[PDB]
């Protein structure tokens, strides 16, 4: 123990201090629930949540199917003392795991300091607690006392693997969006986790194992705490701000509900989907909310419902909001300290950064959707530790995230049935009109495609440059060094003491926050197409797990369920389809492993594209890129038109005529005229940086996302090939009569392992290629439209400033040539584009 300085057993008796039956805010009445206080301001309740929502009482699968990639239902889970005990030890262990990291130590500390604001009075000269931020703690003698708290962890409602962060609302105030904060209830379970597919970590790991991987539940809990942090500090982005997707095209998703907050909280490339304009909008919005809080602290003449003094309570909120105070005692919001605190909560505390600290395998995007659900047990030390998670040191599970590999570490992951059917939410893609060849494509296997309305700019808007024009210091890049800098400003003692309040009504009446009405997206929309598609080519490579598979080179594999499509050569099919005599089986399998490697490790080298040095030719026939077909045709297609060929949809990238600067002059004041010129020149630098950041934003959301899904499909295609080949080989083995056992002695697992190495080796090359395309399209097809407008702008500012200096040669006299040289040198050179200035992540940065 360390963060949880207590080693609870569920059955331990009640004491009314850290083990007690409690009453939480509720729509009407609830019977007390036995709860545990694991740490100051933080409680845990080992019950399924049938309390927080009056609508969520039943624990069964709902009548309406629910449009999520993964879900799980079992009304029996968490109803025994034994399960409750294990939940309590599970949640505890995850807290300790989060606390062992520098990042987690800060976040948990931030959480404890983030006391919800005392803004419950209708009289604005008083500080009063808001009741729904408290709970009632039953005593052994039957009586109760009320207590403030910041965080409650409760078991999930009906859908066992829907982890979410809920809190109670107010009649007039928006507590999670006004700076105040409110006590957060996290529905969470440490007894289940998600299965997902990797594609992005093989470069740093050639030896990565075969199938699905398991999310470390410490990441899942951290993510939720990050949400909780935002709402505790009342700076959460309105849930009405969401990423709207286009849905009408055949390759697009039928729908997706991602919020700004969800993407902000993940971090990584996803956070950069949110354009600067809205980012400045949100920061400025919460700045003002903090300002209002300071005012209210200055208005306060009294405090009700506690024995703590006004002075102590004013000090608590000064400490939370990092307010400064005069010697007279006036509280204020310093713009510098705010920006630091808001960045810490907003951009330092992200899911992507925790993964850096946990050293686990994890999704690199929110758009990498969960695929499976697993039963887990993280309590035994031999399963999962505070220090390594599943990947225990000095064990087979230490390297290549093996302990997270669902196949190698099968003792630890039991697959459960996904209650969301594979083709429950889908589009129907058909090719030829009386006869049709139709395939269902899972909603979440389709393309992202954000709508144009999510991206805004004021690049067209003009400006006046004065000697008083604000120059903003360049944004300090989010990195492990910045996090280190913030870690050193923490002082890990002096958490706000558990002050006693007067008792509330024994039933705390509260409603959860609105949660906006969101209509189900349409389902099973049919599409009639003339040409096969990426999805068709992919489906053709699958077979049924009547048993004898055969490989072939055309999509009529979509016709026979016993023929499977391969993008491998005609030579390879002859060999793998060839019926093989027993005395020659081993030599056959060995040669097939070499052939498989030769087919998958193909790399064409070029100097004809620029920003693209390698080309993997088989991506052409593997996913039907451009439709044209043929490997040597694909290299030719790529060389002719560049990276665009890979995209399913071409983004629009319209940069308007950039707003020009009008300069103000100051007759006979040399110094202020000098400042106007400098402020104009540094404002051009800002303008360049702004167009670059805007283009990058667009590129990440509309382009790089397409490539991200294209590597997933490439890993699928490869996996499909290895399965077809294995099936074929195993069928061949199974035809021999007992000349198998003593003589052949064939290990299908060693084969499966060899093929997995090839797939790994191939994906290294595929990642290199797809990154190059991605960056290439940015550099050649998007950035040039930015630079063009910026060039026109420099020429305008050049003329303005050389005229301005001439018209003020009377005022400037001392140094007109100096300033004339400064303008000529600054504006005759483009500000060069550095990608590391605009992405914090490391992939696509090597390139």
From Swiss-Prot:
Ligand binding (Zn(2+)): 223, 227, 262
Keyword terms of this UniProt record: Cell wall, Disulfide bond, Host cell membrane, Host cytoplasm, Host cytoplasmic vesicle, Host membrane, Host synapse, Hydrolase, Lipid-binding, Membrane, Metal-binding, Metalloprotease, Neurotoxin, Pharmaceutical, Protease, Secreted, Toxin, Transmembrane, Transmembrane helix, Ubl conjugation, Virulence, Zinc
Domain of life, per lineage: Bacteria
Annotated effect of mutating residue 351 to A/Q: Wild-type KM for SNAP25, no protease activity, about 30% less Zn(2+)
Disulfide pattern: 430-438
Entry similarity comment: Belongs to the peptidase M27 family.
Name of this chain's protein: Botulinum neurotoxin type A
UniProt source species: Clostridium botulinum
Full protein segment contained here: 3 to 865 of 1296
């Amino acid at each position: 123990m360390e963060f949880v300085n207590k080693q609870f057993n569920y059955k331990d008796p009640v004491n009314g201090v850290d083990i007690a039956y409690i009453k939480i805010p509720n729509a009407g009445q609830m019977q007390p629930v036995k709860a545990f206080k694991i740490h100051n301001k933080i409680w845990v309740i080992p019950e399924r949540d049938t309390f927080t929502n009056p609508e969520e009482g039943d624990l069964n699968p709902p009548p309406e199917a629910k449009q999520v990639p993964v879900s799980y239902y079992d009304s029996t889970y968490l109803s025994t003392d034994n399960e409750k005990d294990n939940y309590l030890k599970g949640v505890t262990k995850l807290f300790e795991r989060i606390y062992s990291t520098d990042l987690g130590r800060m976040l948990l500390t931030s959480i404890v300091r983030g006391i919800p604001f005392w803004g419950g009075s209708t009289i604005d000269t008083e500080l009063k607690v808001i009741d729904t931020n408290c709970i009632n703690v039953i005593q052994p003698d039957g009586s109760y006392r009320s207590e403030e708290l910041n965080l409650v962890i409760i078991g999930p409602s009906a859908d066992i693997i829907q982890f979410e962060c809920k809190s109670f609302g107010h009649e007039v105030l928006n507590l999670t969006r006004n700076g105040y904060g409110s006590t957060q209830y996290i529905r969470f379970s440490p007894d289940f986790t998600f299965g997902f597919e990797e594609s992005l970590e093989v470069d740093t790991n050639p030896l990565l194992g075969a199938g699905k991987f398991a999310t470390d539940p410490a990441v899942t809990l951290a993510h939720q705490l990050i949400y909780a942090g935002h709402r505790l500090y009342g700076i959460a982005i309105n849930p009405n701000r969401v990423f709207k997707v286009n849905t009408n095209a055949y390759y697009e998703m039928s729908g997706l509900e991602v919020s700004f907050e969800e993407l902000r909280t993940f971090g990584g490339h996803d956070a950069k989907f949110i354009d600067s304009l809205q980012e400045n909008e949100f920061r400025l919005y919460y700045y003002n909310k903090f300002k209002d809080i300071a005012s209210t602290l200055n208005k306060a003449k009294s405090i009700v419902g506690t024995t703590a003094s006004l002075q102590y309570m004013k000090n608590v909120f000064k400490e939370k909001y990092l307010l400064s105070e005069d010697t007279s005692g006036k509280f204020s919001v310093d713009k510098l300290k705010f920006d630091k605190l808001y960045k810490m909560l907003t951009e330092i505390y992200t899911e992507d950064n925790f993964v850096k600290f946990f050293k686990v395998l994890n999704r690199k995007t929110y758009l990498n959707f969960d695929k499976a659900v697993f039963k887990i047990n993280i309590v035994p030390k031999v399963n999962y530790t505070i220090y390594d998670g599943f990947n225990l040191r000095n064990t087979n599970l230490a390297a290549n995230f093996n302990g997270q590999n669902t196949e190698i570490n099968n003792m630890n992951f039991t697959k459960l049935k996904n209650f969301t059917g594979l083709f429950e939410f889908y589009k129907l893609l058909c090719v030829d009109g009386g006869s049709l060849q139709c395939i269902k494509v899972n909603n979440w296997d389709l393309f992202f495609s954000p709508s144009e309305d999510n991206f805004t700019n004021d690049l067209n808007k003009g400006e006046e440059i004065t000697s008083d024009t604000n120059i903003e210091a360049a944004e300090e890049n989010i990195s492990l060094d910045l996090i280190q800098q913030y870690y050193l400003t923490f002082n890990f003692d002096n958490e706000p003491e558990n002050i006693s309040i007067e008792n509330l009504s024994s039933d705390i009446i509260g409603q959860l926050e609105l949660m906006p009405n969101i209509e189900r997206f349409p389902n099973g929309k049919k599409y009639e197409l003339d040409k096969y598609t990426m999805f068709h080519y992919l489906r053709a490579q699958e077979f049924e797990h009547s048993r004898i598979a055969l490989t072939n080179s055309v999509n009529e594999a979509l016709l026979n369920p016993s023929r499977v499509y391969t993008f491998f050569s005609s030579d390879y099919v002859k060999k793998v389809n060839k019926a093989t005599e027993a005395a020659m089986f081993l030599g056959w399998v060995e040669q097939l492993v070499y052939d498989f490697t030769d087919e998958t490790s193909e790399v064409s080298t070029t100097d004809k594209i620029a920003d693209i040095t390698i080309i993997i030719p088989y991506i052409g026939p593997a996913l039907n890129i451009g439709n044209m077909l043929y490997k040597d045709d694909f290299v030719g297609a790529l060389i002719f038109s560049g990276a665009v060929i890979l995209l399913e949809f071409i983004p629009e990238i319209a940069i308007p005529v950039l707003g020009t600067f009008a300069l103000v002059s100051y007759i006979a004041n040399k110094v202020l005229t000098v400042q106007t010129i400098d402020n104009a020149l540094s404002k051009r630098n800002e303008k360049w940086d702004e167009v670059y950041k805007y283009i990058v934003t667009n590129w990440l959301a509309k382009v790089n996302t397409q490539i991200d899904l294209i590597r997933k499909k490439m890993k699928e295609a490869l996996e499909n090939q290895a399965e077809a080949t294995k099936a074929i080989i195993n069928y061949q083995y199974n035809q021999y009569t007992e000349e198998e056992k003593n003589n052949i002695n064939f290990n299908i697992d060693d084969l499966s392992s060899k093929l997995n190495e090839s797939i790994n080796k191939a994906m290294i090359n595929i990642n290199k290629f797809l990154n190059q395309c991605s960056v290439s399209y940015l550099m050649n097809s998007m950035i040039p439209y930015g630079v063009k407008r910026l060039e026109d702008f420099d020429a305008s500012l050049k003329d303005a400033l050389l005229k301005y200096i001439y018209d003020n040669r009377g005022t400037l006299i001392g140094q007109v040539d100096r300033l004339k040289d400064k303008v000529n040198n600054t504006l005759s050179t483009d500000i060069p584009f550095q990608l590391s200035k605009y992405v914090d992540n490391q992939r696509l940065l090597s390139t």
